[PDB]
Symmetry: C3
Subunit: 40 residues, 3 copies
Amino acid sequence: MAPVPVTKLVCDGDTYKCTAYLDFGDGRWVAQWDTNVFHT
Amino acid sequence: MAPVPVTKLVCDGDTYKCTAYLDFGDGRWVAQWDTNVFHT
Amino acid sequence: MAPVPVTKLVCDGDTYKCTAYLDFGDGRWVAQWDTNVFHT
Ligand SMILES: CC(=O)N[C@@H]1[C@@H](O)[C@H](O[C@@H]2O[C@H](CO)[C@@H](O[C@@H]3O[C@H](CO[C@H]4O[C@H](CO)[C@@H](O)[C@H](O)[C@@H]4O[C@@H]4O[C@H](CO)[C@@H](O[C@@H]5O[C@H](CO)[C@H](O)[C@H](O)[C@H]5O)[C@H](O)[C@H]4NC(C)=O)[C@@H](O)[C@H](O[C@H]4O[C@H](CO)[C@@H](O)[C@H](O)[C@@H]4O[C@@H]4O[C@H](CO)[C@@H](O)[C@H](O)[C@H]4NC(C)=O)[C@@H]3O)[C@H](O)[C@H]2NC(C)=O)[C@@H](CO[C@@H]2O[C@@H](C)[C@@H](O)[C@@H](O)[C@@H]2O)O[C@H]1N=[N+]=[N-]
Ligand SMILES: CC(=O)N[C@@H]1[C@@H](O)[C@H](O[C@@H]2O[C@H](CO)[C@@H](O[C@@H]3O[C@H](CO[C@H]4O[C@H](CO)[C@@H](O)[C@H](O)[C@@H]4O[C@@H]4O[C@H](CO)[C@@H](O[C@@H]5O[C@H](CO)[C@H](O)[C@H](O)[C@H]5O)[C@H](O)[C@H]4NC(C)=O)[C@@H](O)[C@H](O[C@H]4O[C@H](CO)[C@@H](O)[C@H](O)[C@@H]4O[C@@H]4O[C@H](CO)[C@@H](O)[C@H](O)[C@H]4NC(C)=O)[C@@H]3O)[C@H](O)[C@H]2NC(C)=O)[C@@H](CO[C@@H]2O[C@@H](C)[C@@H](O)[C@@H](O)[C@@H]2O)O[C@H]1N=[N+]=[N-]
Ligand SMILES: CC(=O)N[C@@H]1[C@@H](O)[C@H](O[C@@H]2O[C@H](CO)[C@@H](O[C@@H]3O[C@H](CO[C@H]4O[C@H](CO)[C@@H](O)[C@H](O)[C@@H]4O[C@@H]4O[C@H](CO)[C@@H](O[C@@H]5O[C@H](CO)[C@H](O)[C@H](O)[C@H]5O)[C@H](O)[C@H]4NC(C)=O)[C@@H](O)[C@H](O[C@H]4O[C@H](CO)[C@@H](O)[C@H](O)[C@@H]4O[C@@H]4O[C@H](CO)[C@@H](O)[C@H](O)[C@H]4NC(C)=O)[C@@H]3O)[C@H](O)[C@H]2NC(C)=O)[C@@H](CO[C@@H]2O[C@@H](C)[C@@H](O)[C@@H](O)[C@@H]2O)O[C@H]1N=[N+]=[N-]
């Protein structure tokens, strides 16, 4: 399938990005998106 | 609760979207957001 | 590491946000991003 599974998910409050490691190809592809990060 | 759990998470480097399958209602609802996708 | 693991992921179709609970600090930090939500 064109969509591929996420194997690990992390987020970073310095860069304000979340990064999803993908099961695809050689294993070195990620998805990454902007995000808010805050303390509740 | 208004927030509902994600059951499966996939991302697509053709559409540049990630899709989260949700545990809600009939099971056919998703969350989907734009994302970057790249090789590290 | 600057990126930290997500422990739980939820999405909300009233607020159109997904929220990732993070393993960081006191445990009360989240990442949150805008998202589409729809029925397939
Ligand atoms: C003791 C200790 O260490 N304690 C820990 C804390 O330090 C740590 O908190 C982090 O601390 C960082 C350092 O203080 C701090 O970094 C600063 O952040 C400032 C604010 O950043 C916001 O505004 C800027 C500019 O507008 C944006 O670029 C940022 O992205 C951010 O904006 C946010 O962006 C996201 C993504 O786009 C938005 O998200 C969207 O939200 C909407 C809804 O609103 C939807 O949901 C969307 O879907 C979603 O995507 C957010 O809305 C938005 N939020 C806001 C309020 O706008 C920066 O301004 C600041 O940058 C300056 O300083 C650095 C160096 O320090 C320079 O490199 C930069 O260039 C810049 O320098 C300035 O440059 C200008 C001009 O260029 C100049 O005029 C100035 O004078 C310069 N100033 C200086 C000082 O040089 C800097 O980056 C972090 O913000 C802060 N993080 C958080 C989350 O609070 C906390 C948290 O730890 C972090 O998170 C955890 C989870 C871990 O990952 C951890 O490792 C990480 O550190 O932990 C404390 N420890 N504890 N407990
Ligand atoms: C052999 C093999 O198959 N190898 C595999 C590779 O093929 C595969 O890589 C994919 O290859 C695709 C085909 O080459 C390629 O598609 C093209 O992509 C071009 C670039 O797309 C970017 O720009 C366009 C336009 O600006 C945007 O629409 C796209 O969304 C994308 O922009 C990105 O968008 C995201 C989301 O908004 C941004 O994300 C944000 O980032 C910020 C920070 O920057 C924050 O984090 C935000 O939170 C975050 O959301 C990105 O920043 C941004 N990036 C950039 C750089 O801007 C398209 O331009 C191109 O489209 C043209 O061609 C198609 C048909 O081919 C037409 O349908 C389109 O209409 C368009 O046609 C053109 O139309 C114009 C005018 O309308 C005309 O003038 C032109 O002449 C027309 N040209 C043609 C040719 O017709 C096309 O879609 C993929 O980009 C490429 N993917 C990646 C990730 O590199 C790789 C990867 O595989 C993919 O990913 C994996 C994970 C799996 O899902 C897999 O199934 C999937 O295929 O794998 C190789 N195999 N291996 N290993
Ligand atoms: C019986 C039952 O209960 N059934 C259940 C359904 O109720 C439930 O569906 C939810 O129902 C809600 C109530 O009807 C409904 O709320 C309304 O939504 C309207 C539409 O909201 C869209 O447009 C507005 C404005 O433009 C935006 O603010 C919203 O964010 C949203 O836009 C979307 O935003 C996201 C994020 O930015 C976009 O995402 C991006 O997408 C792009 C691609 O497009 C990329 O992927 C990006 O990465 C991604 O981020 C979307 O694209 C975008 N979509 C669109 C189409 O634009 C609101 O307009 C409406 O607000 C009015 O009413 C409320 C009160 O009701 C007021 O508080 C507001 O202020 C506002 O009031 C109006 O104010 C104006 C001026 O200020 C005034 O002129 C008007 O007269 C006022 N009107 C009123 C009536 O007062 C309101 O919020 C939900 O939309 C609907 N949700 C969905 C998903 O369909 C469903 C689903 O349940 C939900 O989801 C699940 C998963 C669970 O979480 C659940 O708990 C939750 O309820 O379930 C049914 N049950 N079943 N099965």
